[PDB]
């Protein structure tokens, strides 16, 4: 089951037209770094309700690595208040990144591919960190993202 | 003389760690002369390591290394061409002499997600036995072979010294991380790993993984060559020859 994303809690960097809110709208309509040349960008999405994450889809847009953390509204929300659900994953090699090739890779991350510790628990916030240090030209961010709860 | 002095000596025999070395002392076995009278008190590994004690303390000229490399790489190619064997250590860094031949082996069909396949290594091992390259075994492991080999000396020819050979079987997807680590130079591997952490990555014998925003090591990244590893950390590729104890 697709989890429903409520709104955007935060965003370290976002383009005027390719803003962080597009991670809500279905299609691709992207999230992108205000300035390419940046090395990582981040967002916090609030969920419609506390639920358990079973599976994650990631739709890439020029990013070299993607990491997904989780948290809750309760207990505040700072830096290391968040737990790593999906550990930094590869979407784009240095060579491809240096040459803007295959920015659009898409990936599924089933239960096994999540840090089981954190996935047993349930949350209502998700931190998403996108990295791209192999270029200071190409735009980078995400096409889309889909979180899932067990059937 | 000093007990530690006796111990420090025994350790120099292959297969005699400090534990086994103290047990030989108590039983009165302090010297080589003593060890050679007490083979029953040693396991095979040690029994043979002592057999070639003299030959294993000598250095190996690069000319011999090369001859050795050829024997190995040939049989391995003829056996199955998809094999990949890379002699590593100081030899790979272009040292004029080695202390021993460190071979690393791999095969596309053997990944870290696949099934353990000792026979990939044993097939290579038993062939080297046929062609009379590997004279003796020290330890026939599932992933690492430890043993003895000798260059051929057709007759009337004064025989070559016996040499230590290691053969590590490694998953293909971890191969060039192994080569990096086992070619390295202690200091180079230390310096490269440190810069890894600078650029937010973690290199080890097996893999290079990105470090998340909270510092949790991510998934092993795809590596099909040493270059790939350098690229990940955006560090200029150093040829093995320049992996000295001089850094730039």
From Swiss-Prot, chain A:
It comes from the Eukaryota. Signal peptide: none annotated. Expressed in fibroblasts, retinal pigmented epithelial cells and lymphoblastoid cells (at protein level). Phosphorylation by CK2 promotes interaction with APTX and APLF. It is found in: Nucleus; Chromosome. The modification Phosphoserine is found at residue 138. It is linked to Spinocerebellar ataxia, autosomal recessive, 26: A form of spinocerebellar ataxia, a clinically and genetically heterogeneous group of cerebellar disorders due to degeneration of the cerebellum with variable involvement of the brainstem and spinal cord. SCAR26 is a progressive disease characterized by gait and limb ataxia, loss of independent ambulation, oculomotor apraxia, and peripheral neuropathy with distal muscle weakness and areflexia. Scaffold protein involved in DNA single-strand break repair by mediating the assembly of DNA break repair protein complexes. Negatively regulates ADP-ribosyltransferase activity of PARP1 during base-excision repair in order to prevent excessive PARP1 activity. Recognizes and binds poly-ADP-ribose chains: specifically binds auto-poly-ADP-ribosylated PARP1, limiting its activity. Homodimer. Interacts with polynucleotide kinase (PNK), DNA polymerase-beta (POLB) and DNA ligase III (LIG3). Interacts with APTX and APLF. Interacts with APEX1; the interaction is induced by SIRT1 and increases with the acetylated form of APEX1. Interacts with (poly-ADP-ribosylated) PARP1. This is DNA repair protein XRCC1. It comes from Homo sapiens (Human).
UniProtKB/Swiss-Prot annotation, chain B:
Its cofactor is Mg(2+). Keywords: Acetylation, Cytoplasm, DNA damage, DNA repair, DNA replication, DNA synthesis, DNA-binding, DNA-directed DNA polymerase, Isopeptide bond, Lyase, Magnesium, Metal-binding, Methylation, Nucleotidyltransferase, Nucleus, Potassium, Sodium, Transferase, Ubl conjugation. Na(+) 2 binds at residues 11, 13, 16. Mg(2+) 1 binds at residues 100, 102. GO terms for biological process: apoptotic process; base-excision repair; base-excision repair, gap-filling; DNA damage response; DNA replication; double-strand break repair via nonhomologous end joining; homeostasis of number of cells; immunoglobulin heavy chain V-D-J recombination. Its EC number is 2.7.7.7, 4.2.99.-, 4.2.99.18. Binds 2 magnesium ions per subunit. The modification Omega-N-methylarginine is found at residue 62. K(+) 2 binds at residues 11, 13, 16. It catalyses: DNA(n) + a 2'-deoxyribonucleoside 5'-triphosphate = DNA(n+1) + diphosphate; a 5'-end 2'-deoxyribose-2'-deoxyribonucleotide-DNA = (2E,4S)-4-hydroxypenten-2-al-5-phosphate + a 5'-end 5'-phospho-2'-deoxyribonucleoside-DNA + H(+); 2'-deoxyribonucleotide-(2'-deoxyribose 5'-phosphate)-2'-deoxyribonucleotide-DNA = a 3'-end 2'-deoxyribonucleotide-(2,3-dehydro-2,3-deoxyribose 5'-phosphate)-DNA + a 5'-end 5'-phospho-2'-deoxyribonucleoside-DNA + H(+). Methylation by PRMT6 stimulates the polymerase activity by enhancing DNA binding and processivity. It is found in: Nucleus; Cytoplasm. GO terms for cellular component: cytoplasm; microtubule; nucleus; protein-containing complex; spindle microtubule. Residues 93-102 are annotated as: DNA-binding. A 2'-deoxyribonucleoside 5'-triphosphate binds at residues 59, 90, 93, 99-100. Mg(2+) 2 binds at residues 100, 102, 166. One of its GO terms (molecular function) is damaged DNA binding. Repair polymerase that plays a key role in base-excision repair. During this process, the damaged base is excised by specific DNA glycosylases, the DNA backbone is nicked at the abasic site by an apurinic/apyrimidic (AP) endonuclease, and POLB removes 5'-deoxyribose-phosphate from the preincised AP site acting as a 5'-deoxyribose-phosphate lyase (5'-dRP lyase); through its DNA polymerase activity, it adds one nucleotide to the 3' end of the arising single-nucleotide gap. Residues 239-252 form a flexible loop which appears to affect the polymerase fidelity. Monomer. Binds single-stranded DNA (ssDNA). Interacts with APEX1, LIG1, LIG3, FEN1, PCNA and XRCC1. Interacts with HUWE1/ARF-BP1, STUB1/CHIP and USP47. Interacts with FAM168A. Belongs to the DNA polymerase type-X family. This is DNA polymerase beta. It comes from Rattus norvegicus. The chain holds residues 91 to 335 of 335 of the full protein.
